[PDB]
From a paper:
The Thoeris defense system triggers abortive infection (Abi) upon phage detection. The ThsB genes encode Toll/interleukin-1 receptor (TIR) domain–containing proteins responsible for phage detection, while the ThsA gene encodes an Abi-triggering effector protein. Two ThsA effector variants have been reported: a silent information regulator (SIR2) and SMF/DprA-LOG (SLOG) domain–containing effector (ThsASIR2-SLOG) and a transmembrane (TM) and macro domain–containing effector protein (ThsATM-macro).
To define the structural basis for ADPR binding to EcThsAMacro, we crystallized and determined structures of this protein in ligand-free state and in complex with ADPR via soaking, at 2.7- and 2.1-Å resolution, respectively. The pyrophosphate and distal ribose moieties are accommodated between two ADPR-binding loops located between the β3 strand and the α2 helix and the β8 strand and the α6 helix. The ADPR/IAD binding sites are located at the dimer-dimer interfaces, but neither ADPR nor IAD is directly involved in subunit interactions.
Numbering used by the authors:
A (entry chain B): 64 to 271
B (entry chain A): 64 to 278
Write the structure that this text describes.
Amino acid sequence: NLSEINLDVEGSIVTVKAGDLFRQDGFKVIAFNEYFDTQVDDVIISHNSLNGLYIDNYLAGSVSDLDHRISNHQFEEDELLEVNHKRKVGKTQKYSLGTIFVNNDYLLTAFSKFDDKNRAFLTMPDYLAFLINFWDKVNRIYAQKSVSVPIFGSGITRIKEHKNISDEDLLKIMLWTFRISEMRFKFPAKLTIVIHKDKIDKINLLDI
Amino acid sequence: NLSEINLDVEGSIVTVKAGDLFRQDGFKVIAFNEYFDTQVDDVIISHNSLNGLYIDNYLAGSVSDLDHRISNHQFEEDELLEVNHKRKVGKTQKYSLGTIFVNNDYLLTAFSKFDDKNRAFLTMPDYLAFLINFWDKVNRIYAQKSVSVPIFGSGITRIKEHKNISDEDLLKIMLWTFRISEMRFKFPAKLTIVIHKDKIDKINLLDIKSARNGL
Ligand SMILES: Nc1ncnc2c1ncn2[C@@H]1O[C@H](COP(=O)(O)OP(=O)(O)OC[C@H]2O[C@H](O)[C@H](O)[C@@H]2O)[C@@H](O)[C@H]1O
Ligand SMILES: Nc1ncnc2c1ncn2[C@@H]1O[C@H](COP(=O)(O)OP(=O)(O)OC[C@H]2O[C@H](O)[C@H](O)[C@@H]2O)[C@@H](O)[C@H]1O
């Protein structure tokens, strides 16, 4: 019946707290799909998803300006993938999972893959690959800085073969993938995992 | 001092014990590389790996027989990768990680990648992807059957950016990923993880019980 716990992981504090991601001070992480889509129409991007809420309610400036900024940005060659020329709707450039686009205090990250068949989806290995690559990026780049994340993949993402996986189990995977990442960093990022305040019932923080 | 432990993981008992993989009853898993190389000459495969030690002392029949058997075997379309024609020494057909070739009571699996200098290596994402794919296969194909494994990657394999990762850390990751796999299988394989008897010094079986809950 508690709402926050601080965890000593590899000699660094990881906070898990009930609350609202959008209210956190510092960097806040928003999961986009692999095309960094921005069309919120409840089929590509759901109005209910954090991706949709951020664009609809919190993105400063227009969605058009954001597309241009992302379009004209230059990512490492490790992060640009094949262009899906034959797509019905949405952007065409694909990005490697974990790629980050910075937008003010928001870290927009290529999280889920998309296709008309499985819509937003990831294999369990893709999910683990995302976490490792993502944690490695934030720990090298945002060392000693605050980074707040939700429970990645607990929304409408179908993790293939894991339709029913629980929020707590995804939280556990997030935690031990973070442990692995920060093994190689003296000063990692200052991570906070936010559980939507109306969902601390779904999770017993003493289990952790 | 403690040499064996039984853990309930997702409602199934997993055994971690000191011993000898080759003395294990039931299926034994041998880590081959992504080409299923069989040439044990300390250039491709080394004599001191379980890969080379299985070929040298435990393989039934000649290495030629095994090569031909693997080449003729019908692998899944997704298990078959592209063919590296530039390779100057060894087999050329790449296989996706976790691919399994069953050989009597041995499960030969494509574990490590070989770079241009025949160095065994994996990235941490590759390693995790191998474990999930491999656990998924054996829990599907060998449900309720004994499957014994060593601590994958604790040999010469370099896990990129984790050169000094401890055997105990690899063990927990193996347990974490196996737990995830059997969230999908109500009747998983009966897993035994074998720590080489002379390496039990490096592993404290008490620091491992939390992994059975995914922590
Ligand atoms: N204000 C909040 N604060 C904290 N957590 C919240 C909040 N609102 C919701 N959550 C919870 O935060 C968790 C994550 O919410 P999401 O990001 O939607 O789900 P995903 O990680 O599967 O991303 C969906 C993907 O597919 C899409 O196309 C996107 O492009 C993504 O790529 C859920 O448990 C929410 O209840
Ligand atoms: N009899 C034994 N019983 C149990 N464990 C053993 C035994 N002998 C050694 N071990 C331990 O078992 C662990 C694993 O030993 P290995 O399989 O060699 O190492 P890897 O997993 O990094 O695979 C080597 C890769 O590179 C190669 O080219 C292959 O192709 C592979 O792809 C070590 O801790 C050993 O001490």
